[PDB]
């Protein structure tokens, strides 16, 4: 939200250079649940987390993709069978 706050001053590329690498593990986290359904956390830094059929849970990227990741994880967890 700082990014929408500043797009037209001299601190725009510095904050951009910080933000472009500050999301690098987050992209890995997204690359986990889609491609293998694998959960990954160390100290707890992931928006989605791990009942009746599935043991998957639900509560940066838009939420329009967050629920898509939540359902694509369950589809992978079914296709593993």
């Amino acid at each position: 939200q700082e990014a929408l706050h500043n797009c037209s001053n001299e601190h725009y590329p510095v904050l951009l250079s910080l933000l472009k690498t500050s999301c690098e593990p987050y992209t890995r986290f997204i690359h986990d649940w889609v491609y293998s359904g694998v959960f990954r956390d160390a100290y707890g830094e992931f928006m989605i987390q791990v009942k009746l059929y599935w043991t998957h849970g639900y509560v940066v990227f838009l939420k329009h993709i967050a629920h898509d990741i939540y359902v694509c994880g369950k589809t992978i967890n079914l296709l593993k069978l």
Binding site: H5, C7, N9
Partner: protein
């Protein structure tokens, strides 16, 4: 006498030329060995330094001093910040001139103040002129695009150097509006908070006539509005 004048004008206040908020920089004026000749020249020189202190202080105060906590149009806002960014770049050759002058004093150790005051006569008119623009913005609480006209109405003067000087600050202030307009017109989402550029789906998109500058006609503004509304709708 020569070299702390550079020290004082540079913005680190002197123990001889006393910085006050009500007398600016001011010579002690009680020496038992001052002469009436030097008095007038020091008085002429200290005006530019007072204005420079005010300018640099204001620019440092209101550019990039928060992480965003609406704000105030004359004390915050992206147009105002861009005004300061143009303003310090306009002030650059003064700093370069002082840097040159020290080399001159080093090369010739016997030099007097009138030589300096003669060289700095071109800022002597430029610095008092530009003060009233930022003074009017600060006092009158001008918000949004009406800032853009204010230096624009003050780029109608009969002094070519001051006019050309203010035009660059206006040119810097155009680009931020350009940057947000590139997003609202072509996608339908704007990138600006608290500062408006005449934006009030198909709801909460109408033209604010009051904030719209005078040198932009209404016919084009209707087309801009229709374009942004259309791309947002489909």
């Amino acid at each position: 006498m020569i070299h702390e004048l550079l020290l004082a004008l540079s913005g680190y206040p002197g123990s001889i030329f006393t910085w006050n908020k009500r007398s600016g920089l001011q010579v002690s004026q009680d020496f038992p060995f001052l002469h009436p000749s030097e008095t007038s020249v020091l008085n002429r020189l200290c005006r530019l330094g007072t204005d420079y202190i005010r300018f640099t202080e204001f620019i440092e105060q209101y550019t990039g001093h928060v992480q965003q906590q609406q704000g105030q149009g004359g004390l915050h806002g992206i147009y105002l910040r861009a005004f300061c960014t143009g303003l310090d770049s306009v002030l650059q050759p003064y700093r370069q001139a002082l840097l040159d002058l020290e080399q001159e004093f080093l090369g010739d150790p016997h030099l007097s103040i009138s030589h300096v005051n003669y060289f700095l006569d071109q800022f002597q008119l430029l610095f008092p002129s530009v003060m009233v623009v930022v003074e009017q913005i600060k006092s009158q609480k001008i918000h949004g695009c009406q800032i853009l006209e204010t230096v624009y109405k003050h780029s109608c003067g009969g002094l070519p150097p001051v006019r050309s000087a203010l035009e660059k600050i206006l040119a810097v202030c155009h680009g931020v509006m350009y940057k947000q307009l590139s997003a609202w017109m072509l996608h339908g989402l704007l990138l600006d908070q608290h500062e408006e550029f005449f934006i009030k789906s198909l709801k909460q998109f109408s033209l604010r006539v009051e904030i719209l500058p005078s040198y932009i006609p209404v016919r084009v503004a209707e087309k801009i509005l229709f374009v942004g509304e259309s791309v947002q709708m489909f």
